[PDB]
């Protein structure tokens, strides 16, 4: 098919199961991209589903804080996902290696996360798997933009209509509604944003236990706090936002729009 003839393959960029990604060049255009090479038939029945989903849903999102898919392509026993090239790594690498972010830079960070997420919800897409590992930095530059990635677990919703889309995502960042087989929708992303914002500011998550059972219990209960000392110097509006995001009833939980208006993110 098209990939072999249009795209020239370069260095090894990253790995992830039966899918090596490489820097590639659309030769005629000259422009360079990240091309996710994926083994076909080494993959499972469910994996091909999550691939169509990824392809379809990414080919829906035009935003500077969402990694753009430029071309989904299938050939002999290999599928090709062509993305915006990004060399700033995961937001996880950067948090880990900087302990935490200042309020200034945490606000600047979750702002971009909130706008990406809002475009997502405007095109009726819910991501269900926001986390520092699934957020990428444009380049190694200071100030480099934050680009939302990995839509393998993303789902399309119809208007503001809620439903059981299955138990899917990541133990730490999962919403209470999901933990209670409740019909869920747009708001599960905000819960996830809350968790990220807490991490951002102190460098650890609000909910965590060595026993999944106890982790899901405290998540379900909204059982987080803002410990001393670290949390003592932190503006009470920053905390406010996190309450409004880690609100436990998704009805009265804050939206992506409401949040981008909040004084902790807006005046910035």
């Amino acid at each position: 098919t098209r990939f072999t003839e249009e795209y020239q393959l370069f260095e090894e960029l990253g790995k992830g199961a039966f899918s090596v990604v490489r820097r590639c060049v659309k030769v005629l255009a000259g422009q360079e991209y990240a091309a996710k090479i994926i083994n076909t038939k080494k993959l499972s029945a469910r994996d091909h589903q999550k691939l169509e989903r990824e392809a379809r849903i990414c080919r829906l999102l035009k935003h500077p804080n969402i990694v753009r898919l430029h071309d989904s392509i299938s050939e002999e026993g290999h599928h090709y996902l062509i993305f915006d090239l990004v060399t700033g790594g995961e937001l996880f690498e950067d948090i880990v290696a900087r302990e935490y972010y200042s309020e200034a830079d945490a606000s600047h960070c979750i702002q971009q996360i909130l706008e990406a997420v809002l475009h997502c919800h405007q095109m009726g897409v819910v991501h269900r798997n926001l986390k520092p590992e699934n957020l990428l930095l444009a380049s190694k530059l200071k100030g480099a933009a934050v680009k939302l990635a990995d839509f393998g677990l993303a789902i399309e919703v119809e208007g503001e209509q809620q439903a059981w889309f299955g138990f899917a995502g990541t133990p730490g960042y999962l919403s209470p509604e999901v933990l209670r087989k409740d019909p869920y929708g747009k708001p599960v992303d905000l819960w996830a944003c809350g968790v990220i914002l807490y991490i951002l500011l102190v460098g650890y998550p609000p909910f965590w236990d060595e026993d999944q059972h106890r982790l899901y219990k405290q998540i379900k209960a909204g059982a987080y706090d803002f410990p001393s000392p670290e949390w003592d110097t932190v503006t009470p509006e920053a905390k406010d936002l996190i309450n409004k995001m880690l609100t436990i009833n998704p009805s009265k939980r804050i939206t992506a729009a409401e949040a981008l208006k909040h004084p902790w993110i807006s005046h910035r």
């Binding site: 880990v96 899917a168 990541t170 960042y173 609000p206 965590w208």
Partner: peptide
């Protein structure tokens, strides 16, 4: 405090 380590994405309820 609690720990920031990396976590993986599940497609189903896998009780750990």
């Amino acid at each position: 405090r609690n720990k920031l380590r990396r976590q993986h994405d599940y497609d189903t309820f896998v009780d750990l």
